[PDB]
Design a protein around this ligand. Sequence first.
Ligand SMILES: C[C@@H](CC(=O)O)C(=O)C(=O)O
Ligand SMILES: [Zn+2]
Length: 335
Amino acid sequence: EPREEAGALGPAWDESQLRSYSFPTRPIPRLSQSDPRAEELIENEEPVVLTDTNLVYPALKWDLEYLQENIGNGDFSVYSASTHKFLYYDEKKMANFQNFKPRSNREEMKFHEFVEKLQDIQQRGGEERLYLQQTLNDTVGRKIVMDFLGFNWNWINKQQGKRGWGQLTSNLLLIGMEGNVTPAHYDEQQNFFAQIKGYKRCILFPPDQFECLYPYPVHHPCDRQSQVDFDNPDYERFPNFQNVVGYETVVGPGDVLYIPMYWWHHIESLLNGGITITVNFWYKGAPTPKRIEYPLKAHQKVAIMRNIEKMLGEALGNPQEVGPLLNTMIKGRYN
Ligand SMILES: C[C@@H](CC(=O)O)C(=O)C(=O)O
Ligand SMILES: [Zn+2]
């Protein structure tokens, strides 16, 4: 249920701001950083919302005005779309599938141009949607460097050390409009998802529901995204989507969601909730142990399936031949 803001300021959000879907969910635990149950969840690679990390405490003052004045004059990747879904597509892989035409268009612009183009849309009451997704780098201004240095690195660095993870891969700044949706997908890295402004509904599915979410081919630009349209699921093509069960939560300013590697997640900015701001922390997972302990975890099988598809695309000399050969291997033999 919705949490209540301090000072009797009412519920931060209500159920009417959530989109409706066909599957059931149960809540992700919201725990304190000092709760041993939170440490045992991160250790067992299960999601958890940490409410009091102070991970991005200096950034909780961030808004469009503050950022525009201090985030520098670097280039920011801004995506536009006529729909609320911002399906990710790997541009490097668009050569393999010359028939894929993205629904989102990427435009590289300055931050003040992003704010202005967002102002125009609001002014003219247009229905275009924008989503800024840019990796933080050296080009940021002094005040943002101060904020960045003010994050609680003492806490997240200990997490990195306790779990044997690799190095921090990147920090992605996310600024989207109310109603924006990032369709279900899984990342190969560990992710700490630090909410700053606004509220986001996060629906996670464990790796063992691979069969229910039907990822695109590895060589397809939408590699690691689900093929299922959550708004209009095609049960004829994707019958096991009727068996999907998610883990749900709504994160607000100060909350940090641990999204374990290979876990699916569907993210949506709450309807009529204003703009959302997020910063995520990606870490390379711990190395694969030398002695493999059976039975294999679900994510290890996903890793195996990915490698088979990759090798097959390399050996055949064309990723388009992957499907035909795989079907030839199974039809009347393993099915
Ligand atoms: C883009 C982001 C989701 C979102 O907040 O829209 C995500 O996949 C991640 O941080 O891992
Ligand atoms: Zn992700």
